[PDB]
Subunit: 189 residues, 3 copies
């Protein structure tokens, strides 16, 4: 139907530093030509659960998709935790076409040998806040179709960068709203 | 139908400092799994209409809802000014179920004795601008389901905090767009 | 149907400094009472393609609309590049009513002789980032119905202001998501 999500439930589903150390909460709702997205990230275990002065202040969460809009297994997000919504959970059928949720390849073209620097419109940059504390910005960069690894047709990545020393804190950020233009393709299984 | 709002019209509808001293403009539009929200606030009378150096730089607007998604009378927003949209105004029938507009309780759980600190995803933090002047930030914090007062089932609060001295100015801020995941429940009267 | 856009394709369509020196990418998707908007801007030729220390750090892109929601020819955006979406392009019929996409005149009234200063809710102010570089903010101000020139019924303007010296760089900014309340009127040709 019209929502792809992680659910807001079940277990750790995502890699920040190590396997399944974090919960990505992501909802993509189809609104015609655009998706309305909503994202947040929490470290449950590992380095980012209790940062140190040496913790790298840059974390990239990569969602890579095939030609059918289906999440690839090399993604940061586990596939077992991502699908069309059903009653606060996900549908039982595993491999559902999702091209209408994919970022538009004309608006957001893959990076090329021809175009040295890609269009800045392929990114959204803003701040979210660590611990929901207003003095603790974390820069969020959302990029569309800028990955080429593992034969991906589409990509959505969420990069969190920061400057301030958040040592001894758990990585946990406020929610961020965004939108992007979708691929026109539609078909199903 | 698919919009709950204050309307952009009628009188002062909200308490910042004193009763009906302000106009909250709020529109919630249902887009499947998410609501697309749009908010702004204006002080019409009282302290916040002409701030002083001693004016507290923190204003919380609380919308508290019952089990049916209906605004509770202890809210900052008057109930007479809040309902489903009809032709630039509101519907005549007063008590309309609105669970499909309520923030999801799994994504945004009420704060618990078990979980000392709640998930940061329960909040959105950004800036709006006082007087629409780019050198006058006001931090907006939107929180979902973080109130427990007056037996509320759900809550949406808008907190405006700031640092700079806005003495002699009227509190009036730019509009802010946001979204949140909705409760799955749907039923009606 | 439910999207008005520039397309993400074809040629320069917009004036920053001189005629057709830039590509405005703008998509407006109708979501009931609100439009979900998405905007970015790129300078292709002229001053803003290679800025200097004397380049004015203020660029206003004006979309002016008639009573039917149709773009006026005095707008910054060329009319040949703006219409309802069709399969990654635009519809062939040129003059299509678009009142349901226009900003609400009660929420966002035209400026008046009576009201010395207009409601700040008529604007959205945030930052986008030049070159998608996180140290290069550009303030975006979106204003609804604040133009009166050329007999316009409605307006949407995008102003980009900045402080930092971006000499030798191409003006190109990250994408920005926003929403606004729509006029209730609906009719067609
Ligand atoms: C919401 C917001 O903009 N917060 C910002 C705060 C505020 O402006 C406050 O006045 C004081 O923290 O200032 C910062 O320098 C900070 O604290 O790190 C950047 C941060 O992004
Ligand atoms: C839209 C925006 O980000 N405005 C910010 C401005 C600008 O960056 C300008 O360069 C100069 O006001 O700087 C501030 O310090 C300020 O004025 O209070 C914080 C404010 O949030
Ligand atoms: C996304 C964001 O907020 N970027 C801001 C950065 C960061 O806060 C970084 O820590 C260091 O650039 O700081 C600024 O002073 C800058 O660089 O111009 C303002 C800019 O808006």
């Amino acid at each position: 139907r019209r929502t792809l999500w992680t659910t807001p439930d079940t277990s750790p589903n995502c890699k920040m530093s190590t396997e399944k150390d974090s919960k990505l909460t992501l909802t993509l709702t189809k609104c015609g030509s655009q998706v309305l997205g909503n994202v947040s990230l929490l470290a449950v275990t590992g380095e980012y659960h209790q940062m140190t002065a040496t913790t790298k202040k840059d974390v990239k969460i990569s969602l890579l998709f095939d030609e059918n809009g289906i999440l690839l297994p090399s993604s940061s997000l586990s596939k077992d935790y991502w699908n069309y919504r059903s009653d606060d959970s996900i549908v039982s059928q595993k491999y559902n076409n999702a091209v209408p949720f994919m970022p538009n390849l004309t608006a957001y073209p893959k990076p090329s040998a021809q175009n040295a620097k890609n269009y800045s419109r392929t990114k959204i940059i803003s701040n979210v806040y660590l611990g929901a504390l207003t003095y603790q910005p974390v820069i969020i960069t959302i990029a569309f179709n800028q990955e080429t690894e593992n034969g991906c047709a589409y990509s959505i990545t969420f990069t969190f960068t920061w400057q301030k020393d958040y040592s001894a804190q758990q990585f946990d950020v406020t929610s961020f709203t965004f939108s992007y233009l979708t691929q026109e393709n539609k078909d199903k299984d």
